[PDB]
Nucleic acid binder design. Structure first.
Lengths: 56, 56
DNA sequence: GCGTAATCTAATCAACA
DNA sequence: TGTGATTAGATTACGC
């Protein structure tokens, strides 16, 4: 009943890690910007940031 | 900065409440179906279902 | 002003590879 | 066999 597991390539992961090192708590504007930049739904990016902050 | 508060009209709330009374833990397919039906992003519908289960 | 949409942490599951 | 997705609790704080 779960969604298909989202896959991130090297460029998307690099951009996400750069934005995370800049700010671990991005606002809705920055999340929407990343969503339009790397072509990933914004909810997926919010989940990615939450998982990242959880692991560290 | 937070996202703008999503607004639901009477019809959207009615459809969501009927689907909730049918199944409080909808799969990704039903959430995407409701998203296409009432024209609301699927993440918003998942959040709505979680908040509903949270009240009840 | 209240109801409830939104966001976070802590925990757990499971899918693609 | 080894990280994205989901859930439950707390909270903050807009829209109507």
């Amino acid at each position: 009943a779960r969604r298909k597991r989202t896959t991130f390539n090297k460029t998307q992961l690099e951009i996400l890690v750069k934005s995370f090192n800049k700010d671990p708590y991005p606002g809705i504007g920055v999340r929407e910007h990343l969503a339009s930049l790397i072509q990933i739904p914004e909810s997926r990016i919010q989940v990615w940031f939450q998982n990242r902050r959880a692991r560290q």
